[model samples]
Target chain A: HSDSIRILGENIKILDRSMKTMMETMKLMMEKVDLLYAST
Target chain B: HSDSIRILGENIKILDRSMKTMMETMKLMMEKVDLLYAST
Candidate 1:
């Protein structure tokens, strides 16, 4: 059970990292869109 | 152990859904950016 708990914790950490990366990428894309619209 | 496995599976499902939603939103934003550039 302890091993299972540790494994679950690690999986959650990886998932959190994935979510953060997606959010950061999304933010960058939105910024690019803003710049694209502004250049006109 | 069964409960742990079930909980982990559910968490992964929710994470998957979140990632899909973010990707869909990003696609929409990119499309909007294309439209903005095209109009100019």
Candidate 2:
């Protein structure tokens, strides 16, 4: 049980970072989409 | 530890669903982007 908890904690930390990056990337993507649409 | 594990498991399940939806949204977004660029 302890080992499982430890492993999950590690995975959660990794997921946290992934989510952070995903949000930043999504923001950039939305900005690009807006700019592209505006140009048209 | 057991409760912590359970909570983490629940959150992980939610994250799984979120990731699934996010990927689907991203696929749709990319398709739209491709069509927009093709039009221009």
Off by over 4 Å in 2: none
Best by DockQ: 2
Interface RMSD of each: 2.6, 2.2
> What DockQ number belongs to candidate 2?
0.40
Question: For candidate 1, lDDT tens digit of each residue in A1-40?
Answer: 7696768767886886889788888888787777765676
Worst 10 residues of 2 chain A by lDDT: A30-39
The two-chain DockQ for each candidate, comma-separated, is: 0.31, 0.40
Which residue pairs clash within candidate 2? none
Model 2, B1-30: lDDT tens per residue? 677777777778767776886787688788
Candidate 1 off by > 4 Å? A1-9, B36-40
Q: Residues A1-40, candidate 2: write the lDDT tens digits.
A: 6887878777886896787688678868877787776777
Best by lDDT: 1
Q: After superposition, how far is residue A9 of candidate 1 from its true place, in Å?
A: 5.3
